[PDB]
Design a protein around this ligand. Sequence first.
Ligand SMILES: [Cl-]
Ligand SMILES: [Cl-]
Ligand SMILES: [Cl-]
Ligand SMILES: [Cl-]
Ligand SMILES: [Cl-]
Ligand SMILES: [Cl-]
Ligand SMILES: [Cl-]
Ligand SMILES: [Cl-]
Ligand SMILES: [Cl-]
Ligand code: NA
Length: 129
Amino acid sequence: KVFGRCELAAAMKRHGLDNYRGYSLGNWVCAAKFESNFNTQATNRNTDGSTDYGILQINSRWWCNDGRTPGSRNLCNIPCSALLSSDITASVNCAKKIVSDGNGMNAWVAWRNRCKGTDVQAWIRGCRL
Ligand SMILES: [Cl-]
Ligand SMILES: [Cl-]
Ligand SMILES: [Cl-]
Ligand SMILES: [Cl-]
Ligand SMILES: [Cl-]
Ligand SMILES: [Cl-]
Ligand SMILES: [Cl-]
Ligand SMILES: [Cl-]
Ligand SMILES: [Cl-]
Ligand code: NA
């Protein structure tokens, strides 16, 4: 599913991400934009053989099981395919664990490089929330 900007903001807010661990909704929408262009089915292979899945490009190195990432963990306790669903519940619950793990949203390199310190509120401007 390819979400609309405000549509995703609303779903994320509903699932409890607005200000989760201090990160305003705009941060999450910005991260999603640059990780996946709001596409739940997005995947990308990493140089180390791991793969990133879904709207927030969660990595099979630590967070989900795809059966093809040697020596990896599955800390969110989910198949990586669950992260491609039109229903973002699995991606959100897993993101909550990631953002809580010490480095906040810096876990998402695209957030650090493209959203961090910017006017992220612009990402939810005009949205009925
Ligand atoms: Cl899609
Ligand atoms: Cl957009
Ligand atoms: Cl915001
Ligand atoms: Cl894909
Ligand atoms: Cl993989
Ligand atoms: Cl594996
Ligand atoms: Cl594990
Ligand atoms: Cl599995
Ligand atoms: Cl933080
Ligand atoms: Na894994």
